[PDB]
Design a protein around this nucleic acid. Structure first.
Ligand SMILES: C[C@H](CCC(=O)NCCC[N+](C)(C)C[C@H](O)CS(=O)(=O)O)[C@H]1CC[C@H]2[C@@H]3[C@H](O)C[C@@H]4C[C@H](O)CC[C@]4(C)[C@H]3C[C@H](O)[C@]12C
Ligand SMILES: [Mg+2]
Ligand SMILES: [Mg+2]
Ligand SMILES: [Mg+2]
Ligand SMILES: [Mg+2]
Ligand SMILES: [Mg+2]
Ligand SMILES: [Zn+2]
Ligand SMILES: [Zn+2]
Ligand SMILES: [Zn+2]
Ligand SMILES: [Zn+2]
Ligand SMILES: [Zn+2]
Ligand SMILES: [Zn+2]
Ligand SMILES: [Zn+2]
Ligand SMILES: [Zn+2]
Ligand SMILES: [Zn+2]
Ligand SMILES: [Zn+2]
Ligand SMILES: [Zn+2]
Ligand SMILES: [Zn+2]
Ligand SMILES: [Zn+2]
Lengths: 131, 512, 512, 131, 512
RNA sequence: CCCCC
RNA sequence: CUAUUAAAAUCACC
RNA sequence: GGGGAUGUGAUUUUAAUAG
RNA sequence: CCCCC
RNA sequence: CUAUUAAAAUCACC
RNA sequence: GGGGAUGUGAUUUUAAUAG
């Protein structure tokens, strides 16, 4: 009964962050303690041309970036816990997220540490030039 | 990269171990392995609550060390050490819940009908030591192992189990031999089960004594022989022989069924051990007796060998004086030796084929009532310890009753028995149907010898001139008591005496 | 859901048969069925070449016909008809290639010990008849049926197999009974197999004699009893009892192993048959002796149980007048009838259960040497035909040797034997460790009567006042010969006579 | 596995006649001892017009008769035993048999007791007039 | 046509029976039934090997016969007969192989923790008689009956089972009562199980005695009371009461869980019987004590009732002289009776509501340390056999310890106990937490009375003027021994005495 | 589920 | 309106 | 591969059948 | 098959 | 030609 | 409804991969 969604490589990381008080710090400590990143994300088959905006309604990707389904890159959506956002609404759920390729090994961590510039809509420090 | 099944990590954890607290290089987790070597990553902690079952299957006892005896012996030494053979079979359960990949001894059975059930117990690597602890296990799937299902709820802790193992081995072997020879069918699981109740080491001597040490105690590090082992829990130097390495294909039951129909009930541990020991006894002794191999003397083996000559001298002398037989036929006589030296009868010797006397006084003969019935009709036929299908009417038979088990008569193949007195004879199963033409021989003492003059003997079976009077002389009274003790020793040994139906002690009383 | 597995078509063709060539209404396909009836359709022709295997499984022999005897009998009739019990178990192979859904008898085993392997042979449907033909078959899947794989290439045609069945049954039962009672464990597949070699009808008489006809030949349509059946291929009127219908749980081995340890080797047909017969013998006879059921005389029973009384009287009388014990204790006597009336000795009858005799001088004694060691210290303890664990030193015992299998002594449960003379007693297994305190009583003859009137008796065993002279009277000569024949008939039937070690024939020569 | 052909009402009669030496006499004794006749025969849906021949290749039935599948009215075919016919060939197997309606309660018995006139091909005593 | 489930033919045979050998008209086969009557058809034979299981479910014991007592009694008589209540529950198995439609008693459990497993045994109609025999049965399907699966291989024959039933009932009830009252939850299956070990009949008297007969022997047709029943196998006149007929909906466990948390382990027979008896005891006695119903005297009930007044007179006198209390508060005193007649203290009475003394000297009071803590702070508060949650510090308490089980203290509901001395009081569970403000009362004998002048008492607890000297007078020595025996009788009965922490025997020694 | 193979 | 099957549901027992 | 089955009653209803 | 519900 | 996985078959043990 | 699984080796072959 019911259709499985998860892989056995993701059990330890997803159990440990489901019982955690602060799941962001828990995931960062799990990574800093030699753990393996979260597998089984949805990688879009885009052609790597388009604007490099971070979070969009449709895949918009550069050649140095990749586009994932945003819900699949939110730790609070992967773990099914309360979002720390006001009104408890995921900003990546229902959108596409742009992860730089050098960080594309671990997208769930990337969206935990980086933030977007509100006037540009692209990742601070990686693509944002409005300094 | 070649590996082995010994000490295999049976746990269900997908990862490996830290560089520390991993026993070998194949156990380290792949985070740490770099260029054939390991790297200490400082951020990674070491697991401190893990429990990893360790597979004890795959032992290879092929070491050559100077002061240490070998466990696995050749079949010549096993033949030389027959009074110590204890069959051994172990049934197992499979670890199911937290570790898969090993089997655990559930039921240990021996040639003696002793079945010992143990709790499923394994060796679990912990971050501080190896814990010998009870683990989750299930019986083997299938229908030929469905009798093992009630045994998981039964069972004893392994300390009690090995105490009982040593106690039973000591009660079985204390009078027979100074060692134990486990007769294994397939030693792969029996060596795993021996890790639980068997030690090894250099050859030691019993405390309180001077016999070889066969048991070892862990409370106090003392060694003991089979006599002084009370509370000892380990077998110190067991020897063993694998019967499947004697050129056998198929099951144990498939190979025991070819030669024996007495045992059965496969996959019960004691029954399989009895089958293994029976198959070994058949392969080693049923074929042909060997007079080259001799055996030490347990006890009463020189009294029996003298009593069966004191009796063979008397009954063959009395049966020839009482009947005046013109001719004698000695069937199965290996040597050109007469039971009585002087006799008016003319003697004739027979055996299977001449047994180390190449002189032509002994003829070769294979006897069977179906083919050799009416050839020796004249005279008497002295069958002394020759086992044929049916003896003729004119016979004086001594036949070993293989249904009498003793220190000298060990169980054998196909209902027979291995009577081991000085030399090992395997005798076929006793049947009274071979004595339909004969009767039992009544006890009697015959003496024609000269006389000399103190409890008086008032028995009437003493056939001598001193009994014709009122009181028997002191010479023939003590001689009668000696012969009576010898005859009782012989018939308690398991020998049955038979004679032709017209035998009577009246003609013995007449010649005087 | 009203259908049976009986005559179920097992072939692999997907559509049914024509309106004709079809045995039943369900054996025609839906293409022809019409409002619960059939309709000839001109297009489809009837199949003229086809082979459909028929499942002869699910027979029900619950018929009540006026002149026909019933195959299944009650427990009381089966108890009355011991010496006809033949255990029966069949192993079966599955039909794999051309048909699927029936089993075929591969190995037929009987409690006699024989195993008969048969070619897999079924009843196939042909458009003209039903053909008894070899079909393609495979052994059952599983590891407890791996010994049936070599049997698929051995095996005789069913003609030779049923002829050998009749030969074996007639060799076994020609002196035991006038019928055969197959002791089954589960009668479904046993009835399936009995379809092949059993043909029933009204009760007939043997041609060539007057005994009940038990075999029937199809070559010449004649019936014969167990003696005159040579070349007969069918068992005419067998009786049978299922033993699972006696309220058992589990398989046959689990229920047999509760009461017996000397049988084993399950799932072999002959060993399962022996297990079945042993379990039935336990369930009917081991409980207690029933004196309401009397069995006919197959031969020399009256001579045996008269010789027992004769030998008992002579032995007890001679022992008493030989040593003059103070008191004898007749352990095990149900009724207070003493052996020697003219005895100056105080008689005390003993039995754990008094056999409803209102003269209650029988004391209540359930003897056991461990607890009753000093129950009687002096005197003698008559143990005639009573079975205890160990006999004391001052005893006179007549034990029954249960290892002597005869027409009167049938195999029993757990090494014991069912001795059937007039009343069937079940005697426990003969253990020679009970006679460690006694010795074997020798043959002797004693008589007090005065005497007078082919060779004169030359014997030192005849204890009579007539024997003191140079010759003996023709009265005690013939009485001695009759007692010798009686003693030989008693000991040849399996009766062992044991006596205290103080017994001797001299104190019988006191009187003369 | 396999398709069932028999009904539970027919077990006792068909077992008893499968082990019998003479199955005809056994069936007649089973009937004379209060037993129930053999059920589950194939009754043809004919229109009761045609010649009244006993055994035919096609249904040929009168108004006082009925036509069954012949194999279903042969006791030796119902019991799967050897036919007493020379060369062991069933004469009703592969044909249609005409049972009079008053005997149509038990056809398997009828063909056991009655025989046909070889020159007419109809049941003796019931329809045959060639006296 | 209306039918009943009693004596239902449970066999699997589709047909009926002959007109003869059918017990009722509904059992005749439909071949014979004609116009509401049967017809003898001469051709049809009668079955002579049939075995038809008979359903013993559906008994209705509602007979009215003159000399025969009724089994089912009203709840008033059951209340009057409380010392005989033995709970009773039976688990069953279902007949599976040759007959379906009945249940068989597998495990019988009683209020005493005695579980008896029997072999599945039914009543099988045979053509000659009804055979009480073992039949094929299976445990009930489901998971709440999976503990009954090992019980099919265990089990005892029913003769041994009813011997043990009578033995256990006799050992339990020989000193309590002259009858047994089986407390059944649902009598449908308990009446079926009683067919196996229960007889009925007119009221009889024990042989060797004059007590009511409660056991019956079938070996000799003799009757016995609970004392003289040795080897008796039937309960002769048991009474019983069904608790589900007291207005209960739901399970037994669902209704026992409302009032008790001590018992559990449903569907084990003895546990269900304990639950049934506990529920009956709660429904009958927990609500309110009734002084109308009295009970006979087992033994030591007049000595206890006198000892608890000998003690109540002393400790309330000594506690008032040693402390000079100005006021007393007697909580729970049902009558206007003083423990000591003369006392300088002023007395005050309390109880729940005035217990049959409508005079206004007694006040109504419901006491509880939560609400009534600080109202009686002055003086002492004498709680004699009044069970409250916590006693205040200034108290003299006698409290029955319900953990002491005796002939007078039967088990009760929710850990309490039914102490039945003359009248039945149900006392709640003892807890030491109610005595945190008190200490135990030390044993002492106080006597101020005049004196007269023979083993000398050398104990120092004897507070009297004769102990101030060297030797105590014969008058106060025997009085001390009487009071000591009374005090020991009282504290062995299960009564615990408590007193305020400042109590000491020093002030008693001072007034002299 | 139980029995048979 | 009464009785008889069949089915379903609920309840208690196993 | 072959079977044999799947326990005991009570009370409401629903359709019917019979009266 | 075993455990949990 | 050597070694390493994967699969299959057979055999022995449970 | 939820899982967890389905034991130990040995020898031949078959494809491959690497050398
Ligand atoms: C001492 C011994 C006891 C006595 C008592 C009975 C006596 C025998 C019998 O008389 C039979 C026979 C008679 C011949 O004449 C001589 C030989 C025999 C054997 C005797 C020998 C001897 O005298 C016996 C044994
Ligand atoms: Mg083995
Ligand atoms: Mg084994
Ligand atoms: Mg079998
Ligand atoms: Mg109950
Ligand atoms: Mg219950
Ligand atoms: Zn989210
Ligand atoms: Zn910006
Ligand atoms: Zn020693
Ligand atoms: Zn053997
Ligand atoms: Zn001398
Ligand atoms: Zn004959
Ligand atoms: Zn047996
Ligand atoms: Zn004489
Ligand atoms: Zn035919
Ligand atoms: Zn004609
Ligand atoms: Zn009494
Ligand atoms: Zn309770
Ligand atoms: Zn005084």
């Amino acid at each position: 009964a019911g259709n499985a969604t998860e892989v056995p490589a993701n059990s330890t990381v997803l159990s440990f962050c489901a019982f955690a008080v602060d799941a962001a710090k828990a995931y960062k400590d799990y990574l800093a303690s030699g753990g393996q990143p979260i597998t089984n994300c949805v990688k879009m088959l885009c052609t790597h041309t388009g604007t490099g905006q971070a979070i969009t309604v449709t895949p918009e990707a550069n050649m140095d970036q990749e586009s994932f389904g945003g819900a699949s890159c939110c730790l609070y959506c992967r773990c099914h816990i309360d979002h720390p956002n006001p009104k408890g609404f995921c900003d990546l759920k229902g959108k596409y997220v742009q992860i730089p390729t050098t960080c594309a090994n671990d997208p769930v961590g990337f969206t935990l540490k980086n933030t977007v510039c509100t006037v540009c809509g692209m990742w601070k420090g990686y693509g944002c030039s409005c300094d | 990269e070649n590996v082995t099944g010994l000490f295999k990590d049976c746990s269900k954890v997908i990862t490996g171990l830290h560089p520390t607290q991993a026993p070998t290089h194949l156990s380290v987790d792949t985070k740490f392995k770099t260029e054939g070597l390991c790297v200490d990553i400082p951020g990674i902690p070491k697991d401190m609550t893990y429990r990893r079952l360790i597979s004890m299957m795959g032992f290879k006892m092929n070491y050559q060390v100077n002061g240490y005896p070998n466990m696995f012996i050749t079949r010549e030494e096993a033949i030389r050490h027959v009074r110590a053979w204890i069959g051994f079979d172990v049934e197992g359960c499979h670890a199911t819940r937290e570790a898969v990949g090993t089997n655990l001894p559930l039921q240990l059975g021996f040639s003696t009908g002793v079945n010992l059930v143990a709790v499923p117990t394994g060796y679990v690597d912990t971050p501080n030591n190896t814990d010998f602890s009870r683990v989750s296990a299930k019986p083997p799937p299938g229908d030929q192992f469905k009798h093992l299902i009630p045994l998981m709820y039964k069972g004893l802790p392994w300390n009690v189990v090995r105490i009982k193992i040593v106690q039973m081995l000591s009660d079985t072997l204390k009078n027979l031999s100074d060692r134990v020879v486990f007769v294994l069918w397939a030693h792969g699981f029996a060596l795993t089960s021996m890790k639980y109740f068997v030690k090894i080491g250099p050859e030691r001597t019993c405390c309180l004594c001077d016999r070889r040490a066969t048991c070892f105690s862990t409370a106090s590090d003392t060694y003991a022989c089979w006599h002084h082992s009370i509370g000892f829990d380990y077998v110190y130097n067991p020897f063993m022989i694998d019967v499947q390495q004697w050129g056998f294909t198929g099951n144990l039951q498939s190979n025991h069924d070819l030669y024996c129909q007495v045992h059965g009930n496969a996959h019960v541990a004691s029954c399989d051990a009895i089958m293994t020991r029976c198959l070994a006894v058949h392969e080693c002794f049923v074929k042909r007796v060997d007079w080259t191999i001799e055996y030490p003397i347990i006890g009463d083996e020189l009294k029996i060998n003298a009593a069966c000559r004191k009796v063979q001298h008397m009954v063959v002398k009395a049966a020839l004086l009482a009947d005046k037989f013109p001719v004698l036929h000695d069937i199965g006589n290996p040597k050109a030796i007469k039971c009585v030296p002087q006799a008016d009868v003319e003697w004739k010797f027979y055996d299977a084929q001449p047994c180390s006397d190449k002189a032509y006084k002994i003829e070769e003969l294979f006897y069977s009532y179906a083919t050799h019935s009416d050839k020796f009709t004249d005279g008497v036929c002295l069958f002394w310890n020759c086992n044929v299908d049916r003896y003729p009417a004119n016979s004086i038979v001594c036949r070993f009753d293989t249904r009498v088990l003793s220190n000298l008569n060990l169980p054998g193949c196909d209902g027979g028995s291995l009577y081991v007195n000085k030399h090992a004879f395997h005798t076929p199963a006793f049947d009274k149907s071979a004595f339909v033409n004969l009767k039992q021989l009544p006890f009697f003492y015959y003496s024609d010898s000269p006389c000399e003059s103190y409890v008086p003997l008032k028995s009437a079976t003493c056939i001598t001139r001193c009994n014709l009077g009122g009181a028997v002389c002191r010479h023939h009274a003590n001689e009668y008591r000696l012969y009576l003790d010898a005859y009782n020793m012989m018939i308690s040994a398991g020998f049955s005496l038979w004679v032709y139906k017209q035998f009577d002690t009246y003609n013995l009383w007449n010649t005087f």
